[PDB]
């Protein structure tokens, strides 16, 4: 599923990401834009052999099991394929564990390099929330 910007902002808000660990909704929408282009089916291989999955590109190195990432963890206790659903519940629940682990949203390379320190409120402009 390719979400629209405001449809994803609404789903993320419903699921309790607005100001989760002090990250405004616009941070999460910006991160999804530059990680997945708002596409729940996005998958990308990392140099280390791990893969990133779904609308928030959650990494099989730590967070999910994809059956092909040796010596990795599954800290969200899910198959990585769960993260590709049109329903973002599993991605949001796992993202909440990730951002709580001490590094905050710096875990998302695209957030750090493209969203951090920018006017992220722009990502939710015009949306009925």
119 catalytic? Reply is no
Q: 55's torsion region: left (phi>0), alpha (psi -120 to 50) or beta?
A: alpha
The least distance separating Pt ion from the CB of residue 39, rounded to whole angstroms, comes to 20
**Has 101 been labeled as part of a binding site?**
yes
Choice between 20 and 53, CB closer to Pt ion: 20
Helices 25-36 + 5-14 axis angle, to 10: 130
Choice between 17 and 69, CB closer to Pt ion: 17
35 catalytic? Reply is yes
Does 15 engage in binding with Pt ion (CB under 5 A)? yes
Does 56 engage in binding with Pt ion (CB under 5 A)? no
Identified catalytic residue from 7, 18, 48, 52? 52
Does 33 engage in binding with Pt ion (CB under 5 A)? no
The least distance separating Pt ion from the CB of residue 11, rounded to whole angstroms, comes to 9
Enumerate the active-site residues: 35, 52
Residue ranges of the annotated binding site for substrate are 101
Which spans of this chain sit near Pt ion (rule: CB under 5 A)? 15
């Amino acid at each position: 599923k390719v979400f629209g910007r405001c449809e994803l902002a609404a789903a993320m808000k419903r699921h309790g990401l607005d100001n989760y660990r002090g990250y405004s909704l616009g941070n999460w929408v910006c991160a999804a834009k530059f990680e997945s282009n708002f596409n729940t089916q996005a998958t990308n291989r990392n140099t280390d052999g791990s893969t990133d999955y779904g609308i928030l590109q959650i990494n099989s190195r730590w967070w999910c099991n994809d059956g092909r990432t040796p010596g990795s963890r599954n800290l969200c206790n899910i198959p990585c394929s769960a993260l590709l659903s049109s329903d973002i519940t599993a991605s949001v629940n796992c993202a909440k564990k990730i951002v709580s682990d001490g590094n905050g949203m710096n875990a998302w390379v695209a957030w750090r390099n493209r969203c951090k320190g920018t006017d992220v409120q722009a990502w939710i402009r015009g949306c009925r929330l």
